[PDB]
Amino acid sequence: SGAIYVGNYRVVNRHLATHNDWANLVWEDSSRDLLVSSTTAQGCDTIARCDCQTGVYYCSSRRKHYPVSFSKPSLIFVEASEYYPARYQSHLMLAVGHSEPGDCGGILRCQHGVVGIVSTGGNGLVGFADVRDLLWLDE
Numbered sequence: 001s002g003a004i005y006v007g008n009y010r011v012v013n014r015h016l017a018t019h020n021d022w023a024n025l026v027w028e029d030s031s032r033d034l035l036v037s038s039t040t041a042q043g044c045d046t047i048a049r050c051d052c053q054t055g056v057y058y059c060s061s062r063r064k065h066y067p068v069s070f071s072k073p074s075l076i077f078v079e080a081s082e083y084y085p086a087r088y089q090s091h092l093m094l095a096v097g098h099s100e101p102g103d104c105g106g107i108l109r110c111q112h113g114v115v116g117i118v119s120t121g122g123n124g125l126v127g128f129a130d131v132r133d134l135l136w137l138d139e
């Protein structure tokens, strides 16, 4: 679990969004596994606007933060699951690191701010749904 709270927006994994998230839907993209809902209170997270390929992510299955090198946002194949059929997930960045089901929502951050959230993994890899292109999150 996990979310980014920026301004009057809450950013979450689309496969973990609540009834409330869908009742206050602003935007969603199944191909990116992202969903943005509106909030009444102001959020105090800063979004990074950069091309960093190094950062630190929170891994709830280890209660630890890990430094990682990660790929550029791209279309990557993701095995079928209870929420999606087998498909290409866009805007996804992979790193070598620990992740297991339950780690989705953990924030990835670089020196400039929030980069994205854990969305995929397996076999010593972890995938992050990028949010740095969503410029509207700030205006």
Ligand SMILES: COc1ccccc1N(C)C(=O)N1CCC[C@H](C(N)=O)C1
Residues within 6 Å of the ligand: 015, 033, 078, 081, 083, 084, 089, 099, 100, 101, 102, 103, 104, 118, 119, 120, 121, 122, 123
């Ligand atoms: C951190 O995630 C993992 C870790 C280890 C092993 C597997 C995972 N994966 C990949 C997932 O949990 N999922 C299932 C829920 C839907 C996700 C998606 N974006 O399509 C993929």
Ligand SMILES: [Zn+2]
Residues within 6 Å of the ligand: 048, 049, 050, 051, 052, 110, 111, 112, 113
């Ligand atoms: Zn950065």
